Amino acid sequence: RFLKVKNWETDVVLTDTLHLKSTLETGCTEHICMGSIMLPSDVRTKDQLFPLAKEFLDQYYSSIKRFGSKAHMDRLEEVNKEIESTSTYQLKDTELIYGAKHAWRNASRCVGRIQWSKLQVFDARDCTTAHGMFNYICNHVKYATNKGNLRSAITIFPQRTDGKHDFRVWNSQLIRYAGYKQPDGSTLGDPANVQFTEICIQQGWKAPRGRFDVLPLLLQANGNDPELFQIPPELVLEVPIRHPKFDWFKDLGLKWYGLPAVSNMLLEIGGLEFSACPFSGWYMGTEIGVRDYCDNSRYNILEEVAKKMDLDMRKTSSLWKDQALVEINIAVLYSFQSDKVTIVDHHSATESFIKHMENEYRCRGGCPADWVWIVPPMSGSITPVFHQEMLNYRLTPSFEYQPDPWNTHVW
Amino acid sequence: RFLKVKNWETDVVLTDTLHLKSTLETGCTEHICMGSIMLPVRTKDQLFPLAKEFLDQYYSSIKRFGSKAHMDRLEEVNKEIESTSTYQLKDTELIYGAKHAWRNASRCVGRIQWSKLQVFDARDCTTAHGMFNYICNHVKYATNKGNLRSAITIFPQRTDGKHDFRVWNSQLIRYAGYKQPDGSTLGDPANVQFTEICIQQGWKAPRGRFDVLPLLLQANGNDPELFQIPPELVLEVPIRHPKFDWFKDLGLKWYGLPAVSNMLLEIGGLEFSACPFSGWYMGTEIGVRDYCDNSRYNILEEVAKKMDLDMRKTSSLWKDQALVEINIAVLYSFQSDKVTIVDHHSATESFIKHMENEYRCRGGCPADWVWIVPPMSGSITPVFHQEMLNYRLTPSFEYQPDPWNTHVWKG
Ligand code: HEM
Ligand code: HEM
Ligand SMILES: Nc1cccc(CNCCOc2cccc(OCc3ccc4ccc(N)nc4c3)c2)n1
Ligand SMILES: Nc1cccc(CNCCOc2cccc(OCc3ccc4ccc(N)nc4c3)c2)n1
Ligand SMILES: C[C@H](O)[C@H](O)[C@H]1CNc2nc(N)[nH]c(=O)c2N1
Ligand SMILES: C[C@H](O)[C@H](O)[C@H]1CNc2nc(N)[nH]c(=O)c2N1
Ligand SMILES: [Zn+2]
């Protein structure tokens, strides 16, 4: 029960003991593996809250090498008394920062975690209105963008109380392009965002109806109806996409935004639930060039790119999609790099992740990792993670999925 | 209890009930997923329940469940077990069992073809020379002058584990690999260890880059014996590129028939330790893995050099570019020579159609996403967005230890 993972390219074998600290459940059983299910899985009772807080404070005080000290037992008693009375408790700033960094550290689907300890945490727990949320989010965006020298950051709004007063960012990311269904057939802009784009229109947003319309923010504070806000465009850094060899590539009129800032997840620390916690890093090139541009249910530009390359598109065995897919991803990396916007290629990120895995096995005893998500969506086997066995398990603090608010919100 | 899988590109949802028929264990638990782990003597006691389960499935499939033929066969097998400690499958049962071991192989993307398997019964074989003869006839039938036909040849089942039949090769046709004194490798690095065994058994190695290995065949537990497949039975394809005239000058070639020979076939508790089977190649097996795995022929750099790519930094995607071209050349060469091959786009599309058909008529289709998704261009194939459930059904193909690690040498 001290499990081992082998890298079949290098024969390196690592021994995992961290998984024994795992608490939550994976969804698999001994009879069925759900490793390719996207999603397995209101208020917390006074009961289950205190074990969750004790577990978290136990790991916190071990990490500052004060396990079982005066401070540890005192803090444990202090939180114990607050829960007894108020039926919740508040984290100290130090514990908030530690918990946010470790929710990233524990995100088994994230290939970017070698950076987990360089996270800028913005405490927004004093926020009360959507206007205030807009202010905090503009400041996040500006800090994280840093004129193209991107910096990781998370902004943490007040924790859930009774489930009636939730803070929520209704956007799935802070910056995403609008999507419009056409009266005849296809889709203008981003198809992934068609329902959200229509919620914003069905709310007051006067859509410019272009290909790359930056969506407004739709912010919900304290359970009230959400409110529309327009991110100042000078805060939205964008990269025109061109190709270092093909001049006609500019003429496709493509761009993308520099800042990936996921805003629909829930952050759990010591049993406390932060339903609004937008966080941001920097892109891996394939996130734009493989998924955002070439998914059939997304921008789906493979057709026209291959045409402009004059490729034989009459049979799949010409690999015309594979050829186009590569050039697109060369262009994305070339454009970001030319404009001095931070970006990492999938070869560099996966190599970093293997090094991070080694570090975590050495200093922490393990690293939970979800092969299905860690391997990039192109050129999988020529990246080092393809040949790396990984163990997937759920540690806390964590980032979790949560329902879309428009399915829940009492309007 | 029913389970659902979702295709996230098409929103098609399917319902799996077949997983309830699952007997064997997956390696996962409620707290850890072993989904990316490459791999996570039987007495009369445990055998009749295995036989009875198999015969129930067999007689259900021919619509005679509970018939007098069914009950008589059950009694016949029971008496044969308690009196001889094993039993013999009928020819009909052997054919059904082999086809369903393929149908159940959750890592195989080519399973739409499962019911068109040619089964050769070699259970009357007694010597290595006889094994050589059966295998020659298999290779000839399967190759069919390039119009490849799926086939399996089944040698006698295990008795006391001291009399195993084994094919010591990992595939029937594979190229030798030679470690040089200077540390370099000539030929296929994957086959260095097996090549050394062959030479130690008296094989005279040509010491070239594409030497077909000899067959090393073990009958009835005796020491294995060397045989040379007649070269006119080994169909090979010179690899050239439809636009790069210089590609032929790399001197590459590959064999047409992929024929896995180291697995164990389990049917009704019986264990067939020598059961070589063959189909036809998916292009990426050769052009991504066999040629571009760092621990294989690893020709990426020489192709990149001859394409004059920017190899200074990885973010130029020179590796991705060279990988697509190599895979174009593999498919082009096979199609030009009329040797059956399938590209990864066609094969994954067929698999989805196969999977949906299996959900309708069978109630499920066990599938291992980690293996089904191709090793390049993953997300532009339809399996990437397909949720899959993995579980173990019997009849099955299993891994088994390499024979040189367990064989007791006669001398
Ligand atoms: C700094 C550079 C980063 C890179 C290059 C990176 C890369 C990635 C990629 C490529 C994915 C796959 C997502 C997809 O395919 O849609 C992912 C998942 C994820 N990332 Fe990171 N990431 C970074 C930073 C961060 C940060 C700062 C956080 C939070 C503090 C974070 C949390 C996550 C989570 C929770 C997931 C999985 C979401 C889920 O379970 O669906 N990442 N990452
Ligand atoms: C007819 C065309 C076939 C195609 C295109 C095909 C394709 C594939 C591919 C690409 C893999 C993964 C290979 C790898 O990356 O190593 C695989 C796995 C597998 N195939 Fe098929 N296959 C075919 C026929 C067959 C047949 C005839 C059998 C047996 C009767 C079979 C049994 C298996 C098994 C057991 C695996 C799992 C291997 C493992 O667990 O290591 N396949 N197949
Ligand atoms: N639900 C739905 C609904 C319809 C279609 C789809 C498409 N199928 C999966 C969508 O994809 C996801 C899913 C979940 C999370 C996600 O984002 C995670 C993430 C987090 C942090 C990052 C930091 C930096 C960076 N560069 N990337 C990051 C990505 C994407 N999904
Ligand atoms: N031990 C070692 C040692 C060092 C390095 C490696 C590298 N890791 C090799 C993985 O490679 C495999 C593994 C297992 C099976 C396999 O073949 C499966 C197969 C079966 C039937 C087919 C029928 C048709 C067809 N077209 N393909 C088939 C493929 C490859 N391994
Ligand atoms: C570590 C990992 O499980 C291993 O490299 C697997 C990944 N997926 C694969 N998929 C296929 N088709 N073939 C393989 O050999 C592998 N290898
Ligand atoms: C069906 C499958 O679970 C789904 O498509 C997953 C597969 N792997 C992925 N991997 C990453 N990085 N991102 C994704 O959205 C997905 N989607
Ligand atoms: Zn699992």
UniProtKB/Swiss-Prot annotation, chain A:
Give the subcellular location: Cell membrane, Sarcolemma; Cell projection, Dendritic spine
What does the entry list as the binding residues for heme b?
110, 401
Highest taxon of source: Eukaryota
Q: How is it modified after translation?
A: Ubiquitinated; mediated by STUB1/CHIP in the presence of Hsp70 and Hsp40 (in vitro).
Expressing tissues = Isoform N-NOS-1 is expressed in brain and colorectum. Found in the Auerbach's plexus of the enteric nervous system. Isoform PNNOS is expressed in the penis, urethra, prostate, and skeletal muscle, and coexists with the cerebellar nnos in the pelvic plexus, bladder and liver, and is detectable in the cerebellum.
Functional description taken from the UniProt entry: Produces nitric oxide (NO) which is a messenger molecule with diverse functions throughout the body. In the brain and peripheral nervous system, NO displays many properties of a neurotransmitter. Inhibitory transmitter for non-adrenergic and non-cholinergic nerves in the colorectum. Probably has nitrosylase activity and mediates cysteine S-nitrosylation of cytoplasmic target proteins such SRR. Inhibitory transmitter for non-adrenergic and non-cholinergic nerves in the colorectum.
Task: Please give the family membership noted in the entry.
Answer: Belongs to the NOS family.
Give the quaternary structure.
Homodimer. Interacts with DLG4 (via N-terminal tandem pair of PDZ domains); the interaction possibly being prevented by the association between NOS1 and CAPON. Forms a ternary complex with CAPON and RASD1. Forms a ternary complex with CAPON and SYN1. Interacts with ZDHHC23. Interacts with NOSIP; which may impair its synaptic location. Interacts with HTR4. Interacts with SLC6A4. Interacts with VAC14.
Q: What is known of its domains?
A: The PDZ domain participates in protein-protein interaction, and is responsible for targeting nNos to synaptic membranes. Mediates interaction with VAC14.
Q: What is this protein called?
A: Nitric oxide synthase 1
Q: Which organism is it from?
A: Rattus norvegicus
Q: Which residues of the full protein are shown?
A: 299 to 716 of 1429
